[PDB]
Every structure is written in structure tokens, then in C-alpha cells.
């Protein structure tokens, strides 16, 4: 935002921050959707306490998806969670907020520790049984499995496709002040 001979040149986009907040909220909501998706595919009465995380030790797809979602919640790379924290840090640096950067880093470290503390209770001595039984046999929702697969695909490798979402969010935020 400099002025040269009464003609100004702007190299900054004022709508980037709103798009950044929207993308962070969207990523958090998407992670929460997959986090609760596994709960929806199991007997929701079998997961009560924090130590009741070994109930996730089941058929390999459930365990792998749960581990990936737990990692994504803490924002570790290269899941969708790391994208939000990295973009927030980049925006804060672009706004020259060193104290805010330090506080965000401390908070992210504390959150990573809290989220990873649950991974300790993941191990179980044997395969668990948290699936509801229909017609005398355990019922697995194929539609829920497909939704969880799509979410896991968009989280594990969705970092490469971040360009289109970022462009869409920037376009949305462009008319916020216009």
C-alpha cells in the first residue's frame, strides 16, 4: 500500500484473512465430521471415558482411520489439520504478529500433546466389538463407510488440492468488502 506520484500500487489482498478464517473453520468442521463419523458407525454407548479409546481397536479400516483422524486433529503434517495451522501462521507472519505467533505455537503444542495423549489408550489386548448387531449379525453401514473413505481421502492427500479451495474462499471473501 504505497503511493508513487499520486498513483498507488497495492500488493496485499485485504480479503485473505477472512478466507483464511473460513478455511480453518471448514477444515475443523470436516475433521469433526470424520471424528464423529466413526462414532456414528459404532454403538455410541461403548465409548464413554477417555480411557475408552481402545474400543477403536477393531477391523483394520476403523483403527487406521481413527489414528489418521487423531493425527489430523492435532494438526500434524501433511493432513488437513496441519494446513489450517500452517496457513494461520503464514497469515500472522504476513500481519507481523510475533507475540501472536508465539502464543499460537504454544497453544498448538499443548493441543498436540492433549490429542496425542489419547493415542496411548488406543492399544487393546484383542479385537474389540463396538458394532451394533442387526439380524443377529453385526451391521456395518456401507454409506457411512463410503463417507468416511471420502473424508479420509480428502484429509490424507487433500493438501495437494488446497489450491481450488483456497481460490474459492478468496473469491467468497472478495465481495465481503466489495
Amino acid at each position: 500500500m504505497s503511493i508513487f506520484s499520486n498513483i498507488w500500487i497495492n500488493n496485499d489482498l485485504n480479503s485473505y484473512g477472512l478466507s483464511i478464517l473460513l478455511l480453518n473453520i471448514i477444515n475443523y468442521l470436516i475433521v469433526f465430521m470424520l471424528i464423529l463419523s466413526v462414532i456414528l458407525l459404532t454403538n455410541l454407548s461403548k465409548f464413554k471415558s477417555l480411557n475408552q479409546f481402545k474400543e477403536f481397536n477393531s477391523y483394520n479400516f476403523i483403527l487406521y482411520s481413527l489414528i489418521f483422524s487423531l493425527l489430523s486433529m492435532a494438526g500434524i503434517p501433511p493432513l488437513l489439520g496441519f494446513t489450517g495451522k500452517f496457513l494461520a501462521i503464514l497469515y500472522s507472519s504476513f500481519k507481523s504478529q510475533y507475540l501472536l505467533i508465539l502464543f499460537m505455537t504454544i497453544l498448538n503444542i499443548f493441543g498436540m500433546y492433549f490429542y496425542i495423549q489419547n493415542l496411548r489408550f488406543v492399544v487393546k489386548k484383542n479385537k474389540s466389538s463396538i458394532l451394533n448387531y442387526k439380524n443377529y449379525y453385526v451391521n456395518i453401514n456401507y454409506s457411512i463407510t463410503l463417507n468416511i473413505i471420502l473424508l479420509n481421502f480428502f484429509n490424507f492427500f487433500g493438501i495437494l488440492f488446497l489450491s481450488d479451495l483456497i481460490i474459492i474462499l478468496n473469491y467468497i471473501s472478495s465481495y465481503i468488502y466489495i
Binding site: 500500500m1 503511493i3 499520486n6 498507488w8 497495492n10 489482498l13 485485504n14 480479503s15 477391523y59 479400516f61 456395518i140 456401507y142 463407510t145 463410503l146 468416511i148 473413505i149 471420502l150 481421502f153 481450488d164 481460490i167 474459492i168 478468496n170 473469491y171 472478495s174 465481495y175 468488502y177 466489495i178
Partner: protein
């Protein structure tokens, strides 16, 4: 590859395979889900790409429109008494006298 339809069809086939595998059921079950999911995914991917291009064009136009907004706000963000300052007198005079033609 290059075709959004081909990419979507491949994505749909892979999604069907992954959903079948995660279900612990054997493959080649509900084969009607394969072509249907492939077509649906291809359509979704093509629509997403077209929407992305249109949104890029619209965002370029919106940024071009917002270019004057930033200049006017910075002129409006001049400190109290800084409007008439020599570093801002030219801009203040152009924006208030020349750029008042409604």
C-alpha cells in the same frame, strides 16, 4: 491425466474399491455401484473444475473493483490532520475535487 471426466471416473472407481475393501465384504459386489459412482464422480469433478475457473474470473473482477476501495480507505485512514499533509495533499485533492463527478 488431462480430462476432468477421466480423472473423476478413475476417482469413482478407486472410491468404490476402497469402500468395498473397508466394508470387509468381498469385491465384485454390487457392480452397478461401480459405473454409477464413476459417472457421478466424473460429473462432480468436471463441475468443480468449471466452478473453480468461473470463480477465478469472478475473483479477478472483484479484486479489480476492490482496488479503488483500498485506495479510498487509505485516504479515509489518513491520520487526523494528515489529510492536508504534503505527502497526502495531492491524493486528498484528487479524490475530493477531481473524483467528485456524480
Amino acid at each position: 491425466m488431462s480430462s476432468m471426466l477421466i480423472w473423476g471416473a478413475c476417482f469413482g472407481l478407486f472410491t468404490r474399491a476402497a469402500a468395498c475393501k473397508a466394508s470387509m465384504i468381498p469385491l465384485t459386489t454390487s457392480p452397478w455401484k461401480y459405473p454409477k459412482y464413476m459417472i457421478v464422480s466424473a460429473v462432480t469433478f468436471y463441475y468443480f473444475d468449471w466452478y473453480r475457473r468461473m470463480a477465478l474470473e469472478q475473483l479477478c473482477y472483484n479484486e479489480e473493483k476492490l482496488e479503488r476501495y483500498q485506495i479510498r480507505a487509505k485516504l479515509q485512514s489518513l491520520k487526523i490532520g494528515e489529510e492536508l499533509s504534503d505527502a497526502y495533499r495531492e491524493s486528498f485533492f484528487e479524490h475530493a475535487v477531481q473524483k467528485n463527478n456524480i
